[PDB]
């Protein structure tokens, strides 16, 4: 019921019902997942039929925090009344480490949030919910509630992090479907919706990761970790995004582990190494008759794997050579896959090259393309701070209408590592729908 | 009687009442963060759950100090008189080295500080609130009480530093969003408020750091440490500002950790070393009829990155070429990243050229543009004891209205280093907010 | 038995209430700090908490000496009568190594200090407070009681130095604020009030140091130290002043330590060294045509930091070339920071050059004008006994009116080493505020 | 009581009271300090505290000798009667090697010194003070008391000097303030009053030094020490005085160390060295018709500092050239300071030149004038056994009227070494200073 029931790295339960409930709960769960939460949802995973016993067992299995949604349908709904609310409230009142989150959606007549609204909808004989801190069912309010919940989880794990060498562990995948057990032995578990475009990440998911990315630096600095560890490795653009979220400029040498269990460590900041592992395969030369009307643009491409797929990059250049000031394509000079030990130095060389292009060519925004291991993608996205970065993703997929296109690079996000208001400045990617 | 009250490196509590206290509490917590005091406030950090219960566990966890904002609305305070304040009073009565700070907004009709008002509104039958120290409700008063709180924290940590370490660990950060657990295993933890422009320190937070820059050297001299240690990173203008606040003239050897786990040592005052690891890429020799009457302007550009970013500095120069007497560009001779071992001598070399350019040109203010790592910049601010610095940071960000503006250097602080009034003499940055 | 009372390095408590108390004790605190005794003051240092309990704790932690200021308002005030006076008198009765100072501002028709009055005014029925010595609440008597406190401190310390190698330790600063834990492991702590004029010290501070200037040589001779060690980093003019206060004639091998924690040792008495380490960059030649009547004037400027700043020296010359018989400019021959033992040697060389300037112009007062490290300034101040020194402070700061004042030197202090009346013959600077 | 009161180095107590006692106390205190013993006086050196318990502590900690000054007002005072007098008599009775001298301002109606007065006025029951030695309250009686007491101190210190490598150590510092802890690890501690003219030796202090100057050669003889050492350093005129107070024939080897901790050793009776360390710089032939009317006058100038003032000496030459018969100026051959090893040889050469002046011209007094380290001045005074010397001291100070007079030497003292009347025949300086 106390410590035996509460575990800092445990999933978070969400309670809801009906159309407004399902809509707000899906938004809340996706945003919270983008914040790095482990979450438990009924539509996520349940053996149907006697759902009451399964819900009770899942709650008893250890729930780090709770989320409560307030709608009149909640008052009408049976499950929220008795199946889980007594358990959640009991675990709240008994265990301090446990957290209870309540979100109000009915709103008052005037339009202010009602603090005592949960009391009538949940029907508790003793209120204790008005005294509970409550956030409105607005996108800013919802992301603020995710703020508080993620920071609570960081607070809970903080003694363990101080014990475990101060190494904060993150798990990131956009491909993995929603799953409660998707949580690993990791402090934060960032998951983003897999899109129907089968290679692009979801536009809604990247909007949510934009809203929640500002907490990632805050989550890390709350963790009190001298180092940051990332396991998994999402799509290349999302990897650049999570790198920009936690730059080595701010805190920590980042060691990234891929799904293939390879350790990508951090060795240094942007640098041209003594022996260059990368080379300048292709560059651009152009005189500008009208240089930089508005913002200048620099697009660059990185190859970290020996097979060369320049055809799509050539198509991108043919489409957009006029806009970009200069483009550079890099490849590994050494034969064989990039060494795990020297991964940080390879990332340093790549980011140093992109820094050279951007800074010399007018401090222009970088249309970055990374083709390499997800850990290295995170590493380069990590080292870039002063560069405004726009990440592109590989797409060999058909058209949204289902027709053939040439291998095309498409934009995902516009990144800046130093933005307090989220490293994802804009989700430029079009929606799958 | 908890021992955690004795623990000095614990956050300081603030208690304020709704609207009447929101402004005073916000200003007080901002000055506390700027002074280096870790603080827990209602807006930043309520872990989800019961507000009264969460405050209870947060206070029981351990607070070195506590401050109460006396406002007329406390008479109707739902949480203060019930749980928030009685725990504070119990801790105050419990242990000697615990801080209870009183800020009173309920001014007497005469206009003097009202000693009896906090006791009356707090509702405590004991008149101990009259005998406790109490400061007025104004920016100067809030700054003075934050002075007292900082002095109490430093005094509590002083025997620990005298017995072991001999190094005062000041951690300053700008883009860390205000939060209680951002405090690290350090003595004093400086934080500023992040704002929208994503590269300029917030004008309000910068003014707070200006007020507390009177106090930070006092923090050092009260800690009694042989030297000063910094762990973390901040806006590079704030880095120059803290360097001015902690000049080499006062503080021993100063070891600065940039958040990467690598620490920059301080070696030697402004000198041109036997080997010039830093060269002058561009030097200014242009004759004007006379130097501009009034304060002469000097613009020194010191970029420590081999990736050259000349666009923004050239734009600033063309903007101010007529006004400034002379300009100097300093970039490292060696292509590799600068080593931590000689970082102190490198910063000494940079400040030596800055002083050459300033004193040779009529002993003028130096418009400092820095691209170096955090430790090098804070050392550069450290060694500029008599030279006058105005720090600039780069903005690829568009104008506040959204219209593009080319890469620009914009002034943040006007530093007259090592000043009793304050090392940030004027907050020259104009942020619309 | 309280081992804190027998600890001589502990601060000194001053008790004072109301307007007369604040004025008299503020003057007394400035005199005590200028003398070297660390002091604890009400207004400047109250850690936030119950003021009565805070004074209890402050008295408990350690008090080498105590001072009570007596006015009728002292009899009126409850705290001065009750919270601290019983503790002070009890510790005075109990422990031998404790000094209690009683200064009376109440004068009967006779006008002599009222020996009996403090016992009744303080609220103590015992006439013991009459037996203690007393002095008038004027500048002269207050300075006398300050010298008595300093002499008691040195008397208590003397066996400790006699055991600890006979090295008297001082820590002296001009721009740390009124502080209690300012005390390092230093016998005397000379702190001069900073007053809102940046590089310029306070006229009140220098005057108060002047009143206690004669005590410093007396402090050294009472300490029975083979040589004096000074930590610190005061201003350059105050540095010359303090050096002249403890001249090379009276103390012997002196190791002055700056804020950097590097030892500037005393090697040799003024001489022209075998290798000239100072070069006469700019010298004035003129016959004695219309000099200053009676007393000729000479200015010697020494800039030991290689960055040459002759603009303000040029302004000083243009202002005062007429009365000045000659001026000599001293700079180091080789570029860099000058070594410690090299520091003693260059101090000897600089004083030799200044002596040559004074005698060649007819044994004249020297407008000594130093731009160098604190230890060197203290050493040149120390070696100049026969010579008379006028010390400046390098205004590079704008005037309070806002009008631009070119970099200029202010005639702050007139110095004459070995003067029994006071090494600060007259404070030349106007009031800071 | 242990032998801790038998130690001779620790000071001697003097007791006075009220108005008639203060003048005798001042004269006796100054005359003992000129004699060479450290003396403790009430108004001089009482640490802050209750005067009764402070006298308790001062007497109990260590006291070699005592003085009870008998005045008509001693009966009225309470403190003298039972606070320190019975304790001093207790120590006198218990410890044999303790000195208690009695001076009587009470005069018998007949006119002889009153032996029986101290017993009744002091309050003692039994006849005690009649048996102990009694001396009148007059300059001759006071100096006779110093005779007896210094001789007792020397008798006590005789075995210690004989055992510990016989060498009689003296400490001399004219410019130091009245002090009781001024004593060093020295047999005698000669002090003179500080003068308000800020450069001149004090008129009253030098008068007392003249009165007690008979004692010092006798003190050296009675100490039974082959070598005599002077410490602390005093005025160069007083340095010549202290040197001539111990002529060459009466001293043997003399190792003089100033406050600088550099040893000046005595080498030979005045001789001209084979290699002249100090050379003639300007020798003058002065033809004065009818030379030596009565007795002739000679002046000599020995500046041992490489910087040559020469201006005040030129003023002396202009003022007194007519009556003067022959004058000589000696400046060192080697550039810089005078080396420690050859100090005795340099002094011998200088005195050889001085004696050449004082003999070749005729039987004449030399007006000796020194710019040299304390040890060489003392040695020069030592070697002036036969020739009669007048010591000069320079003044750059403004005249007491306030108007300026160019650098000047004033006639301070005329010396004739080894005389029984006193080495200080006259204090030529006025007594107004």
The ordered string of helix (H) and strand (E) elements of chain A is EHEHEHHEHEHEEHHEHEEEEHEHEHEEE
Total count of domains of chain A: 2
Look at the helices and sheets of chain A and give the structural class: alpha/beta
Q: What about the largest sheet of chain A?
A: 7 strands, mixed
Query: Which strand order do you get reading across the main beta sheet of chain A?
Result: 11-13-12-14-15-16-17
Instruction: Tell me the Rg of chain A in angstroms.
Output: 23 Å
**Most extensive interface:** B-C, 61 and 47 residues
E-strand count of chain A: 17
The oligomeric status of these chains comes to: 4 chains of a larger assembly
Distance between the termini of chain A: 45 Å
Q: How much strand content do the residues of chain A show? A: 15-25%
* Overall body shape of chain A: elongated
Helix content bin of chain A: 25-40%
Count of runs of 4 or more consecutive helical residues of chain A: 12
Domain TIR (chains A, B, C, D): 12-82
InterPro entries (chains A, B, C, D): SAVED, TIR_dom, Toll_tir_struct_dom_sf
Domain SMODS-associated and fused to various effectors (chains A, B, C, D): 218-411
Protein name (chains A, B, C, D): TIR domain-containing protein
């Amino acid at each position: 019921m106390p410590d035996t029931a509460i575990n800092p790295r445990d999933p978070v339960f969400v309670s809801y019902r009906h159309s407004d409930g399902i809509a707000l709960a899906a938004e809340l769960t996706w945003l919270l997942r983008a914040a790095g939460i482990p979450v438990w949802r009924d539509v996520d995973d349940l053996p149907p039929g006697d759902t009451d016993a399964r819900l009770q067992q899942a709650i008893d299995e250890g729930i780090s925090g709770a989320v409560i949604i307030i709608t009149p349908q909640i008052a009408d709904s049976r499950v929220v009344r008795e199946v889980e609310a007594p358990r959640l409230l009991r675990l709240h009142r008994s265990s301090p480490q446990f957290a209870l989150g309540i979100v109000n959606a009915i709103q008052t007549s005037t339009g202010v949030v009602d603090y005592d609204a949960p009391d009538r909808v949940l029907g508790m004989e003793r209120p204790e919910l008005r005294s509970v801190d409550q956030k409105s069912a607005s996108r800013l309010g919802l992301v603020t509630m995710a703020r508080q919940m993620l920071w609570h989880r960081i607070a809970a794990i903080r003694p363990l992090l101080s014990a475990s060498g101060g190494e904060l562990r993150l798990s990131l995948q956009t491909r993995n479907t929603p799953q409660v057990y998707d949580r690993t032995d990791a402090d934060l578990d960032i998951r983003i919706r897999p899109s129907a475009h089968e290679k692009l990440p979801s536009a809604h998911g990247l909007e949510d990761f934009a809203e929640t990315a500002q907490f990632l630096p805050d989550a890390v600095t709350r963790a009190g970790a001298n180092g940051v560890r990332i396991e998994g490795g999402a799509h290349l653009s999302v990897s650049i995004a999570i790198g920009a979220a936690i730059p080595s400029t701010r805190v920590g040498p980042m060691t990234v582990v891929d799904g293939r269990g390879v350790h990508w460590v951090s060795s240094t900041e942007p640098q041209l190494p003594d022996e260059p592992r990368l080379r300048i395969v292709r560059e651009s030369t152009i005189p500008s008759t009208a240089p930089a009307p508005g913002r200048p643009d620099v697009a660059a491409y990185i190859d970290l794997q020996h097979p060369r797929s320049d055809a799509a990059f050539d198509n991108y250049l043919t489409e957009h050579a006029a806009e970009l000031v200069a483009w550079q394509h890099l490849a590994p000079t050494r034969t064989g896959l990039l060494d795990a030990a020297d991964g940080g130095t390879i990332a340093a060389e790549a980011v140093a090259h992109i820094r050279e292009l951007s800074m010399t060519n007018g401090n222009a925004v970088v249309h970055l393309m990374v083709r390499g291991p997800f850990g290295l993608a995170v590493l380069i996205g990590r080292l870039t701070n002063t560069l405004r970065v726009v990440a592109y993703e590989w797409t060999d997929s058909d058209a949204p209408d289902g027709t053939f296109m040439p291998p095309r690079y498409e934009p995902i996000v516009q990144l800046r590592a130093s933005t307090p208001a989220g490293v994802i400045e804009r989700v430029i990617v079009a929606d799958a729908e």
